[PDB]
């Protein structure tokens, strides 16, 4: 009797969003709501169709996760005008009204976490050095991606500016390092090209890779320039999301780290919150200062997300039930 909640997921080719999907379809009906499931195939026009036949079949709620953030304004303004209102997840969608509360992780710390891990690793603090750094970042149209470049630049500015990370390529802007798609095939590209224009000589320390499918590029492209032996041994790579391939790479010593965002979280945040707006309540928020999408900044709840190597894995992986033991072989 509760309706029907239309939830639009940008891909299935970043396992994540499978799971972000599964877990919202089995918690609200747990809430006593149908849902209408979709994945774009990041293809921005399937998500703007799927959204707008969402609109059009009456769901009650959208719940959309965007694969291209500015891509919906007309499409929202519809649902607006039908009364359904718009959770943002995961990823902020910008330059329209109306969105009405945003849930995601705390994506400034996400990149925090990613470059802890390199200057802790590499003993910079200390004195130790130089070593040389390069960055990725995520999509331009995915606003976290700048979230995530600047919470780990936040880190690593002050070792940069000394000298003791040197960023070989000078390849150091957000607009210079951004990866279309999140695609591991251009990830692996412009790691090729920076090995062999860059390093013509000396090696690459550390890799800011903010992304799992990144961070199986990167290393592929690595593999390719000679490293990964006992003479050579690949640089610290982090991610983002504890991909399954991306744990198997962290187990056998290749991947140095991701970071998990358990999406059994976020889709029950994401569901409890959404039933508060159906039903008249108040959506809990802890952050109403950050998320500025262009036109406002969106009410959100950001949750926790958790850094991971090989010391932790099974802890924060397994022992949690995330994943089986043979899921991750
Ligand atoms: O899909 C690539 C990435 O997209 C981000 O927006 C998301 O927060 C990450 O967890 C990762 O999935």
Same mark, same amino acid.
């Given at each position: 009797?509760?309706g029907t909640?239309?939830?639009?997921?940008?891909?299935?080719?970043?396992?994540?969003?499978?799971?972000? !999907?599964?877990? $919202?379809?089995?918690?609200?009906?747990?809430?006593?709501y &149908?849902?209408? #499931?979709?994945?774009?195939?990041?293809?921005? /026009?399937? /998500?703007?169709? /799927?959204?707008?036949? $969402?609109?059009?079949?009456?769901?009650? #709620?959208? =719940?959309?996760? +965007?694969?291209?953030?500015?891509?919906?304004?007309?499409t929202?303004?519809?649902?607006?005008?039908?009364?359904?209102?718009?959770?943002?997840?995961?990823?902020?969608?910008?330059?329209?009204?109306?969105?009405?509360?945003?849930?995601?992780?705390?994506?400034?710390?996400?990149? =925090?976490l990613?470059? *802890?891990?390199?200057?802790?690793?590499?003993?910079?603090?200390?004195?130790?050095?130089?070593?040389?750094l390069?960055?990725?970042?995520?999509?331009?149209?995915?606003?976290?991606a700048?979230?995530?470049?600047?919470?780990? $630049?936040? =880190?690593?500015? +002050?070792?940069?500016?000394?000298?003791?990370?040197?960023?070989?390529?000078? /390849?150091?802007?957000?607009?210079?390092?951004?990866?279309?798609?999140? &695609?591991?095939?251009?990830?692996?590209?412009? $790691?090729?090209?920076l090995?062999?224009?860059?390093?013509?000589?000396?090696?690459?320390?550390? %890799?800011?890779?903010?992304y799992?499918?990144?961070?199986? !590029?990167?290393?592929?492209? #690595?593999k390719?320039?000679?490293?990964? *032996?006992?003479?050579k041994?690949?640089?610290?790579?982090?991610?983002?999301?504890?991909?399954?391939?991306?744990?198997?790479?962290?187990?056998?010593?290749?991947?140095?780290?991701? %970071?998990?965002?358990?999406?059994?979280?976020?889709?029950?945040?994401?569901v409890?919150?959404?039933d508060?707006?159906?039903?008249?309540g108040?959506?809990?928020?802890? &952050?109403?200062?950050?998320?500025?999408?262009?036109?406002?900044?969106?009410?959100?709840?950001l949750?926790?997300?958790?850094?991971?190597?090989?010391?932790?894995?099974?802890?924060?992986?397994?022992?949690?039930?995330?994943?089986?033991?043979?899921?991750?072989?």
């Open positions: 009797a509760k909640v239309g939830i639009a997921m940008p891909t299935k080719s970043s396992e994540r969003w499978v799971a972000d !999907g599964q877990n $919202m379809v089995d918690q609200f009906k747990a809430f006593g &149908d849902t209408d #499931l979709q994945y774009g195939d990041d293809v921005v /026009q399937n /998500q703007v169709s /799927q959204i707008e036949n $969402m609109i059009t079949k009456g769901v009650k #709620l959208l =719940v959309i996760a +965007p694969i291209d953030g500015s891509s919906l304004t007309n929202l303004q519809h649902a607006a005008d039908l009364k359904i209102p718009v959770i943002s997840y995961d990823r902020l969608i910008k330059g329209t009204p109306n969105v009405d509360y945003y849930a995601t992780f705390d994506n400034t710390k996400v990149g =925090v990613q470059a *802890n891990y390199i200057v802790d690793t590499l003993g910079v603090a200390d004195g130790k050095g130089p070593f040389n390069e960055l990725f970042a995520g999509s331009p149209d995915d606003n976290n700048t979230y995530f470049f600047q919470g780990a $630049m936040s =880190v690593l500015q +002050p070792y940069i500016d000394s000298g003791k990370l040197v960023v070989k390529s000078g /390849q150091t802007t957000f607009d210079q390092i951004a990866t279309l798609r999140w &695609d591991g095939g251009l990830a692996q590209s412009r $790691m090729d090209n090995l062999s224009q860059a390093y013509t000589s000396g090696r690459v320390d550390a %890799v800011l890779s903010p799992d499918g990144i961070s199986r !590029g990167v290393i592929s492209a #690595l390719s320039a000679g490293y990964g *032996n006992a003479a041994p690949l640089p610290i790579v982090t991610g983002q999301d504890a991909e399954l391939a991306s744990v198997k790479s962290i187990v056998a010593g290749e991947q140095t780290q991701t %970071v998990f965002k358990d999406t059994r979280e976020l889709a029950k945040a994401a409890q919150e959404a508060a707006v159906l039903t008249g108040t959506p809990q928020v802890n &952050d109403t200062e950050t998320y500025d999408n262009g036109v406002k900044v969106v009410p959100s709840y949750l926790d997300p958790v850094s991971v190597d090989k010391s932790n894995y099974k802890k924060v992986l397994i022992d949690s039930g995330y994943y089986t033991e043979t899921q991750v072989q």
